[PDB]
Amino acid sequence: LDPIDXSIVLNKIKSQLEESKEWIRRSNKILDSI
């Protein structure tokens, strides 16, 4: 049988997860100023 594959999907979650972390980095950056 053909091996199962969603490497494209899982890679998209990794990429999206990095964008989420950057948004939190922006938020904590502003709170440090308050």
Partner: protein, 46 residues
């Protein structure tokens, strides 16, 4: 540089963090569904 304006920008940034998390969840559903489709059509009749 207003205190209140600084608080709004942090919530807006936090919301975008949440939105990308929501996109990730949606893709985890697709991933798990791909596993169910793979055993129901490739493994079970094998």
């Amino acid at each position: 540089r207003s205190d209140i304006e600084k608080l709004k920008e942090a919530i807006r940034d936090t919301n975008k963090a949440v939105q990308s998390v929501q996109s990730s969840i949606g893709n985890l559903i697709v991933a798990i569904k791909s596993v169910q489709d793979y055993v129901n059509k490739e493994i079970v009749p094998s």
